[PDB]
Amino acid sequence: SEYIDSELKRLEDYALRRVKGIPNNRRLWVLTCMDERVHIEQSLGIQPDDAHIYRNAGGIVTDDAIRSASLTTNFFGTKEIIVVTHTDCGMLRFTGEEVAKYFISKGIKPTEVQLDPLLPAFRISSEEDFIKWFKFYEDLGVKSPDEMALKGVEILRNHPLIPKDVRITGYVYEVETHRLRKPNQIIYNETSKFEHGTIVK
Amino acid sequence: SEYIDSELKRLEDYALRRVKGIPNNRRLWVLTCMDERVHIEQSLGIQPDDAHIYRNAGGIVTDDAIRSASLTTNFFGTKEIIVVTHTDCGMLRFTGEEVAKYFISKGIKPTEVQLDPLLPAFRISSEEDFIKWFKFYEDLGVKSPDEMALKGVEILRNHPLIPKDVRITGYVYEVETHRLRKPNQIIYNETSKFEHGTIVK
Amino acid sequence: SEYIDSELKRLEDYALRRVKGIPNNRRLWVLTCMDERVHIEQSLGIQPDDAHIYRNAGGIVTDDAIRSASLTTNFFGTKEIIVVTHTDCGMLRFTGEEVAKYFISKGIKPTEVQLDPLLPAFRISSEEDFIKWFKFYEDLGVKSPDEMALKGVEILRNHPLIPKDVRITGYVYEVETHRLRKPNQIIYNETSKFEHGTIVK
Amino acid sequence: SEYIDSELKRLEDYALRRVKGIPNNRRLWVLTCMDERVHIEQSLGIQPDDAHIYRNAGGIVTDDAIRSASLTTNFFGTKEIIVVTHTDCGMLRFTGEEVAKYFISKGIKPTEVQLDPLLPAFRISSEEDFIKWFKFYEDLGVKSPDEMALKGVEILRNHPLIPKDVRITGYVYEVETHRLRKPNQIIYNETSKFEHGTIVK
Amino acid sequence: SEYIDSELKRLEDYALRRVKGIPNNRRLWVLTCMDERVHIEQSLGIQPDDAHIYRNAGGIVTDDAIRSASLTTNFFGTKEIIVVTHTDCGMLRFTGEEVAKYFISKGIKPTEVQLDPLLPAFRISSEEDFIKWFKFYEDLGVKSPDEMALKGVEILRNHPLIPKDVRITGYVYEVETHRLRKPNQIIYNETSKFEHGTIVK
Amino acid sequence: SEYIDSELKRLEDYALRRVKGIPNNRRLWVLTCMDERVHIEQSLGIQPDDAHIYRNAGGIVTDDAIRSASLTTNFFGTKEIIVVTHTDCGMLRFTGEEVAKYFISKGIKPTEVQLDPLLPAFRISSEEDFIKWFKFYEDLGVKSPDEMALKGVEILRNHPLIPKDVRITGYVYEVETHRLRKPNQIIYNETSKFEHGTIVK
Amino acid sequence: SEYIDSELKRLEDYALRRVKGIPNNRRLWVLTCMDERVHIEQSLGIQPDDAHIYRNAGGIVTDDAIRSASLTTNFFGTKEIIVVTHTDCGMLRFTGEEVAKYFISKGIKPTEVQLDPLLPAFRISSEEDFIKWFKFYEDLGVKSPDEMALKGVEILRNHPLIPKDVRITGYVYEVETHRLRKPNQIIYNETSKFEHGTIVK
Amino acid sequence: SEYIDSELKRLEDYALRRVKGIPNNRRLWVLTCMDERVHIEQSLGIQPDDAHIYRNAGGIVTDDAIRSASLTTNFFGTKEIIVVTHTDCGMLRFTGEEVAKYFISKGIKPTEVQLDPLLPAFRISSEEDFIKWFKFYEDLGVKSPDEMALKGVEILRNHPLIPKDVRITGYVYEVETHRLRKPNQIIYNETSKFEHGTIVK
Ligand SMILES: [Zn+2]
Ligand SMILES: [Zn+2]
Ligand SMILES: [Zn+2]
Ligand SMILES: [Zn+2]
Ligand SMILES: [Zn+2]
Ligand SMILES: [Zn+2]
Ligand SMILES: [Zn+2]
Ligand SMILES: [Zn+2]
């Protein structure tokens, strides 16, 4: 009875965290890609309830990412951000020119497409802006996921809507090993080639 | 050895799906909220590699959602979309006016904040637009997650960038029971109030 | 040989609990419905030997419930009562008028039916009493299982045959979610609508 | 999607068996005692959702038992009844005289106690009726649980509110062995005494 | 290495117990029947290596039992004996007369059968001794397994080859409950009859 | 109803196998040693109710073994016998001279000890017979458990009280490996010496 | 009985495979490095009894490798060879000059060290031969494990002691991924750079 | 995040143990046979990353074994060696004469076969040397795996390329029991003979 009450209150508190001002278990927000192969929680070593996980095409900083990140940090008590791009990302496999050309071929008029139906204030007035909107790596002048992870970290770090006390870190998810690496730590070459090793003490 | 070869071809395929033209394992894109309590794959009954999962604050249709959905459907071969909002969502616990007022208090100037750093073409020129940008349920005139799931489905259905042959369906994730429901199909009211039954035959 | 002896005594104790003045393991009696979907022990978090479980149509306080409750508390040492009604209960799906009219249709004469064969002193002398005997929610002016759990608790609390030092509590078993809730503390509405929350401190 | 719908409908049906006129999985109603030691489903070899389980002090046919049995058989489609009394039942350890005398000692006035608060039509007008109301084995002239199981079966069989096509069977739950026996099948004497055996063919 | 020394010394002691003078884990010897239904270890609550288990037709004290018991107690360090007869024992289902008559019918000549081929000194010179040799309960004037368990205990207690410091105890295995009892301490009669219980403190 | 009925008989039959002339499930009788390390049923691959298991000091054919074997085969329908001696058996670690000398040292007078109290007809009238009665391997001129298994098989095979249609087999239980072997079929002698191998084809 | 005979056929065959001319389960021989990180069976997808696994410093073809390979193929019926070198192998981390210099520093005289004590015919008569004996990648003019896998395959393919009908294949074990790759097919470059992909058909 | 950086730094260390000069986890090198039945790590009670495992035909000390042992001990920090031969080893099933005669039959010219293609300095100049090269037990005058384990230990112990502070131990893997034993410490012969046993205390 006392047990049931105790456990019911626990449920009430879980069901209404966002009413009560209860944060996620680890005060963590993650930006990553929507890709199926990015099994994000296992790679971070976290449990289902530990983090808020934002996912878009590319794990790239968009207005929506910044929107979501500003809310979680300022209102839902998140004190840590982790940006995780990944290998073989689709955003590194195509160009916005290709995509735009693909759409005009069907009959789409870039200038007069409602990009955010729920926010008509968002408009572009240029086909070059339409191309940049898709945020493909090449169009953004980004050569690797490593560079993109660093790019996103710097953006979020410098953005006014995100508190300065929030810790922000970037990684790259390797789909070929279901696991992270530090951006630009690439030991794949180093292991298949001579390097003078040291005698064990 | 022969089985080792074709296994390596298979890992090669998995590693390079997005290069090679392989979709996710059933051709599925999911829009849902970033919330920690939304354990999305278990509720859909899917495996890690089965779907592209888009997640933002509220599981609401933003430009980024439409961007991501347009790419998966037209280029990555997704033929099904599932929109899943959830109960006790933060977007249904606050107002954009409150959030805007919070930011001005710190010293932020809504008009001159770069909302999308990587896309400077996105501007608002109005504090009312800044409020609407956050996309809180109240400000969008949406009363329930049920209504928001239906709203998102309709938007995606009617959007030109999303092919007409794509199946789109909406659900609500109940955090208090880790289980989906159809919008407006709440069993919890009907079971706790007289309703006439039928005699068994 | 010693540990075998002791074990045989406690085997003997177990088989003769009701001679030796041994109570149930938690000194608990539960009133609930006979319904198949009410998996009562798992919902209370109790083990098979922990409680005396009374079950009738509706988990409603009848003379038999009070009989059984009086015996367990006064003679079998029960110090706690838990009343548990449930959702989609049959007693909330029909009316006694319907049931009575069903029986007369077959040829039953309400006035002349022996309701308690082993206790002929129980008679009604009125078709209105026959209707009330079935104890359907509607006929008793009870709108919900929540209200019926509270009702039963109050009855047992006020009844002279039940000691005043017995703890009595009420809950509702949700068949939809195989889980208990406190009467009138339904979370499902609250989570699905706007309610203002607090910022995380 | 069609999977989720299918499973939600399965849940809809479970949650509203009683609105939808759906029976228990096995069309079974069980009368048994409230005693903790009677682990009824295990002994019948049935699963949680298979039966409606009525439980009172003694597994004795009361008005409430007949009320509940009439409803399940006529309205909820139950086609089988099993009566199961048990060994070392409390109703076989005391007398109603003892119980009545116990209550007068505290200050209770049998004549003026509301036995069924929700049904004031139930009255006794005699201390002998009050004694018989408790339904102790000895006061009913019943010597064993075996006899009581048979007695209950006969009552239910002959009662007009219970359809004649319903199968009714009686057993005795042995708490010493957590298992059932046919009433009056006592092999315990037969196994510890000489008995001419037969050679195996 | 450390581990492998340990592993090897474990095997060596276990495999050479009777050379190295190592006792059974519980310094226990059990006399019981060969019957399949007597699951002796489970009923004593012992592990495979805990005891020396002697088993013959009936769990009766024979020369071989006394031989085996004398060896385990004096040489293998057994300090406890447990005699356990059982219910529905074959030795309580037939007579030696019947068995002897059965053998003569085939053509056996009792007087000239080698009863112990490895010990020719064992002879009988009487048909009445041949009958007694089979050791059926009836022919020994024993009415119950309870009585036989007590009988065997007394014999072993008073036998000179068995040290006086050895603890000897008797039980009866109930095949119909897979469960021991003290001899002549039955409850099954007591649990299906009225008996005044006592109110719980 | 039907299920519980057929189960109660399965149980009634189980409790009264020896009255009804139902045998053990394999129609098997096993002669083995009482030693703790001989985990007999696992080594034979049998279940608890499958066999009658006779156990004495050494798994040696004694009068009691023959008594028990004659009863199980002729009356309890056993059609197979398995003799299983074992390694490091105590009967192969001492001599009857040693044992006899140990007993006289305490004060025992071999000639006047009742070897079978329940069968006074069994007498020896010689200290050499007393030695032989213990049935140590050495005194019987048996060098190995292998030889003893074969010896027991031969005795039982040629004994008139045991039907000739009964199948009799011998094995040795290796305590060092919890596993059986056929007599004098030791794999360990062959795997550590040279043995002309055969080219694989 | 006839169960135990199959059990013993299995044991006898398993333990005398090399006598009886029974091959390994997969007719496979593997050459790989002794390195701890090379979890060879898992990477080949084979079971413990499937292959003969030769391991030395580097997974390099030595006389011993050829000795072992010639025996398994010609006599033990192996029909497939798999050579698997690995990344970060020690043989690609040092030079034989370094090693030789290390040994002379301690006081070793290369010319007069017994390199094969059991085969005195193996001698070198040159410090350059001593260096080459260690078989370091650099000294052999081999740049990668990929190249070494191919080299080993070619050697074994062209060697007269190895039958021509034996299938020989080479792979590289990636310690950093605990999985295999085909010589010179490294995808990790390709997954972190732009590469034009295909629209899912 | 800090946890994640810590785990990345381990993965880097693991991937480059040989460059960075980290040993195997128990500074262990094992010499054993390539035979499938020798499940070496389970028998040693070690984990995959715990040792460097050298395997050839027979677990015999060859030049390659010494090469590999010298490198692991002097450069990779191995401080313990374990030599483990095994039962039913192929090297104890054939003779080098047989093998040589087999090869000449096909048309091989022993004198002119490149035994180590990558080390031309290795030559034999004699058919007797060719026979000895195969290193069959019989040709080396070794009678058992026990003797061979001891032999290899002594060779490695006395070899100048192996440091004197390295611990070297020998065992024999019994394929018949998947278990290691010390050289010549065979319990099997000791458990089937008579052996003076000690009385227990
Ligand atoms: Zn991506
Ligand atoms: Zn949300
Ligand atoms: Zn109900
Ligand atoms: Zn009872
Ligand atoms: Zn018996
Ligand atoms: Zn023994
Ligand atoms: Zn290596
Ligand atoms: Zn071998």
Tab-separated table of C-alpha atoms and ligand atoms in Angstrom, chain C residues 32-38 56-59 85-92 137 175, chain D residues 18 52 76, ligand 3:
chain	number	residue	atom	x	y	z
C	32	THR	CA	-11.488	-7.269	-6.052
C	33	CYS	CA	-13.490	-8.403	-9.099
C	34	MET	CA	-13.614	-11.965	-10.447
C	35	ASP	CA	-12.663	-10.667	-13.925
C	36	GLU	CA	-9.937	-12.640	-15.776
C	37	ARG	CA	-7.974	-9.555	-16.691
C	38	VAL	CA	-7.470	-8.487	-13.073
C	56	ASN	CA	-16.918	-11.264	-6.666
C	57	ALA	CA	-18.704	-9.665	-9.618
C	58	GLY	CA	-17.460	-6.101	-9.455
C	59	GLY	CA	-15.249	-6.092	-6.380
C	85	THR	CA	-12.091	-2.268	-8.519
C	86	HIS	CA	-11.183	-2.281	-12.206
C	87	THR	CA	-11.753	-0.671	-15.613
C	88	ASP	CA	-14.252	-2.175	-18.104
C	89	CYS	CA	-15.956	-4.019	-15.266
C	90	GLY	CA	-19.116	-5.869	-16.276
C	91	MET	CA	-20.995	-4.248	-13.404
C	92	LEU	CA	-20.521	-0.981	-15.318
C	137	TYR	CA	-22.911	0.480	-10.823
C	175	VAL	CA	-7.025	-3.795	-17.481
D	18	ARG	CA	-17.148	-6.573	-21.413
D	52	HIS	CA	-13.516	-15.717	-13.793
D	76	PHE	CA	-20.468	-13.212	-20.095
I	3	ZN	ZN	-15.431	-6.607	-13.027
